Chain A
């Protein structure tokens, strides 16, 4: 009875890329032919700005670079001069079959893992995890820098059953916070749908459309591509000449439900990751010196039958929902 050397999990909750579109406010009940936010080209010059090399402030190296320019070329994405509301539209599919791995060497380990997740599910449903994923859908969180400094953010979630809308939701995303996970009627009604999708109790497809009113002609922020006259400095992601956010960036913005840490006094959720780490803070919160971490908790709860704290089981099942390459 040991941890298998191969463990792969397919992702549940897989979104698509988010196409950015631009239109006026109060024309958002007819937003089916709004133009795409394109990616343009501008030239950018600025002087030196960094910290200078310490111990090298002699006037030999000093008087060289500060008068010679730095001529870049970047990409920008802007709203048109008659458009003040960004439209961001993607599609979310909820799959179910959470604890079942893709590849697994051992069958005794697979037998123990399926029973551990199956006794998680009937003890307490996916309704808590889905209640926290529905909050990250209900406010915008996937509008990463398109959300700060906005007039209004409005989120629409449709349940696409066959080819049409089985149910429409409608959220004003700024009254819904960014720290608290308070409960609503129509938000528990969305948590029920995502919770039935995570437990295999029906096929779930969701179309999410977010309207953020930022201002006429302002800059929107699509995701930035890795650069391999002529677009030297910044590349922005577009799919068929329409600016877009990556699917994995939206997926990160959905899995920000982790509010349990060994050290906490109130800092907000981070994304569910093993060794729970923030790229914009350089720091891991689930370091294994504290014994609250996905591999430690998973291995105890499967092998040694050490059932964790009831709050940590949510973290472990959220790591099984996000997928990954475990084992070695």
Chain B
């Protein structure tokens, strides 16, 4: 439970068009959690210093999902819908470097820490965060601001260290009315490890054993299907170095000549989509990223979710 938020912030219903749907070399679907943990850090270096606050955690709640896919004739797999790119200066068609896209309706429980809570009102913070977050892009996709027939959904804020124990189930059961048509994505790292010593029949690794939880696999009649622990998905769970760290000028194709570089690989894990009524406290639902730069581990998870 590192850096417990003194305030939760609910960016209520963000509508996103053309988000990246590939998300890893192995997975596809809902985009990576590192996109969200980078989005909250891009908020943090635009309004977080001007308000002296700290946006550090993020809760991912997907309300609506739609992918540009199509199922071919005579196959049970999917293929991705594409865009026609511009031509070359030769007049010929360029290569088809395929990309997956998805529409996306999301909610973001942010978590605020600093001393700027105690200087500004709770309504000043929420507008300066919301109207900033309509200038940015989430997963390569445009955050589309509100216009409709209904009313724009407002950006609330709790102060979850404030109140009695009756307010600690009056407040955290008031936001859950605004998160309930969708599902929350949490990190399940203990399941994939306790399913690894569960396999005593074979002695596998975590690669073939995360592939054995994605399955609606069918067991022989002693037919039947093996039991469901929930709605489990594979997620990208960070990065891992495959190179030593380079000095910040000794590659001349970097994004900048002031930051060190590593060549990294992906690092795959397990997650679960669950209704937010199973959630005891909504601060346990937040995504952080910790790094071990002495190792090569750059990863993200939801800690404090038992």
Check whether chain A touches chain B (CB < 8 angstroms). no
Residues of chain A touching chain B, judged by Cβ–Cβ distance below 8 Å, are none
